């Protein structure tokens, strides 16, 4: 009912090889020529990616900074408040970045902080100014 396993025999392919006398050797030649096309397109992107790899030698090891292991806190000293307002001005609502700037504030009291000082620090206006950029 089916062709033996590992034989490939579809009606569309047979017409393609029976169409003329040399329709066999052309169809095979096109694939042979199409393969060398792809093999050397490999050589080319493989050559390109060899150059890109040379540029990344050293990685970013010299540009790394020590990790700031720093216990959290819930008391907002005046300096930290002022860091916050500036972080809001440059980070919009990205609470993770803002918590990462202040350091000792976790992501939640940052969230809390916007409501707590919303009026005293014109936090609306600060976000409106951030929205314009």
């Amino acid at each position: 009912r089916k062709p033996p396993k590992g034989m490939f025999l579809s009606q569309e392919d047979v017409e393609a090889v029976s169409a003329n006398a040399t329709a066999a050797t052309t169809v095979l030649r096109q694939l042979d020529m199409e393969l060398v096309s792809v093999k050397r397109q490999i050589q080319n992107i493989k050559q390109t990616n060899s150059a890109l790899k040379e540029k990344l030698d050293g990685g970013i090891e010299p540009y790394r900074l020590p990790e700031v292991i720093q216990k959290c806190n819930a008391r907002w000293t005046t300096e930290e408040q002022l860091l916050a307002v500036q972080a809001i001005r440059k980070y919009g609502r990205d609470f993770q970045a803002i918590s990462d700037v202040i350091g000792n504030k976790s992501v939640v009291q940052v969230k809390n902080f916007f409501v707590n000082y919303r009026r005293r620090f014109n936090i609306d206006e600060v976000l409106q100014e951030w929205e314009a950029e």
């Binding site: 062709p3 034989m7 490939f8 095979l28 792809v38 970013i60 972080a87 990462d100």
Partner: protein, 666 residues
Amino acid sequence: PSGVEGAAFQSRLPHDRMTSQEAACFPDIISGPQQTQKVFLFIRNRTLQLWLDNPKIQLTFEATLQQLEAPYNSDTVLVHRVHSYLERHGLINFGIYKRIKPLPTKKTGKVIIIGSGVSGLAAARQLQSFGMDVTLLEARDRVGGRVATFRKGNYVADLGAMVVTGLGGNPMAVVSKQVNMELAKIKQKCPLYEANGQAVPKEKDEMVEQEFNRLLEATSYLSHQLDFNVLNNKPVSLGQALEVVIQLQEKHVKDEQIEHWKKIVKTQEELKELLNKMVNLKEKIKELHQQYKEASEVKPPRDITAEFLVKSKHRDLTALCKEYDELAETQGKLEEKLQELEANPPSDVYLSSRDRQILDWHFANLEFANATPLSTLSLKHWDQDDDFEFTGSHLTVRNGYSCVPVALAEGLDIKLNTAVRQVRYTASGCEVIAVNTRSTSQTFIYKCDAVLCTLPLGVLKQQPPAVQFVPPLPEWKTSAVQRMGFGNLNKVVLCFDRVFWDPSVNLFGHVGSTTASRGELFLFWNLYKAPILLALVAGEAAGIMENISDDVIVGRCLAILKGIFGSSAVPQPKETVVSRWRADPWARGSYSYVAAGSSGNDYDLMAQPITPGPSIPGAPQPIPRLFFAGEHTIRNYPATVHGALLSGLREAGRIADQFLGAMYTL
């Protein structure tokens, strides 16, 4: 099979239903109640058994009835009918038996048989035992036809048929009991040796053979499920379909390589796109580090914007340093996915130029089996006889196959060196005109009620005609003769004075350098007592080698043997014989084949007898006068010795039913 059921199998009959032939002789039984059908079938199967269990004596009707148990021996006329049907159509009391009831003193009717090959001899022998006057006309100086045995000293080697293809249901089995045939099995083991002279390693031999068998199975798929049987208004041959199937395998190998490397480029580009983010990010990191340093350089105490700038750039730098790490995870996931695919590429080739040479040998077998290039075989029909193959080992005849025709010729009127030249058949009878092959002027006229032609298909094919028919054969017959295939196959007998091959091996192959020469001396046979090797020439090679002298041919044989066994172990042969069957004017080929554009239906056309027109217009339609037997006339067993023999038995029954009457039909 076993019992009475085994006699039906050994007579190529179903044990539990009635054949078309016997429905015609017993239309009362078959149209009647199944109880009588089963009685009939048992009477048939039992009588066959009786004959089969001892085929060296005639099985008379009385001996049959005595040994028939009740209730089967109650209907005495049914038993006499069944026995007479079997006897007439050569299912019992055929071959070389002692005859209990000696022949009637005076004969009835007169038949001329053209050719004393096996088909002729089998018919002649039956006709004579039915009480007819039979004379065989034979062009050669020996009987047997295409059964041809070489004999010199104690050298013995067949130039014609060599093997008995199994005894399961084979009529030769009965003959082998009647005639002393030294039947020796053939061990299937066939070592191959490439053109250099060195054995093909076992890993290769199994893989190419299995591809060969798969390629064949594949053409059957093209034929049946895809109906690839006409191409450009012409019938497709097996050979064409094999090239199409090989090409599509070569194609799929390339299709398979293309998509593999296309998975490589798809991800090399995905890598390129990744390395581009990483250059650009490492430059952003470079700049931003500088800015953090400068901002860090302003020493404390700092106002809060200057403090924010340090904290800010630090956050921003670790963020970017985190992206560049997530993207070097991904770079490693892909640098491996690449070296993975590089490690496992698909098959480079479908078959190497060494493989396709070994595959070419398996095609030379198939070309030998069908005695013709595969480009001539009908794709649809070339194997239409496979369903009727016999069971058991194939055998050879150690004392030479000719012992069989010679045995059958005993007691028959055979005129040798008598070349039939013209066949005339009229409403009142037949006259056959023949000449003496030694001096063609000497002319003979034979007059008879009936002619049985067993002229080889190659002879019937000859233009201009070797034998003229008067009147000419009808178009439906001559067209069958055109459409059919009559192939070619030759043998080189090599008679040495020392066995230097492996005597535990009956047959070994030689692989050819080229496709075009794949049949040229491709197979060697060790079959005989004496030191004789036998070398085959098949396919397109057969017709070519006939135009090459014997010494050149035995030469090329010696080179191949030296290549395998060493130039020191292969002596010059004492005696050499080279067949040229297409050149033989009484054969013009070796045996028939299902040609493209033909079918097994043509084998039936060949067997249909000819009935001439009335001598006086308005006279009643006459009896058939010209009958045909021979291997080209038996659809289910063409191109074999058993097939010839069966066809002789068939016509003898057919002719007797015409001229002696069939009294078993009431």
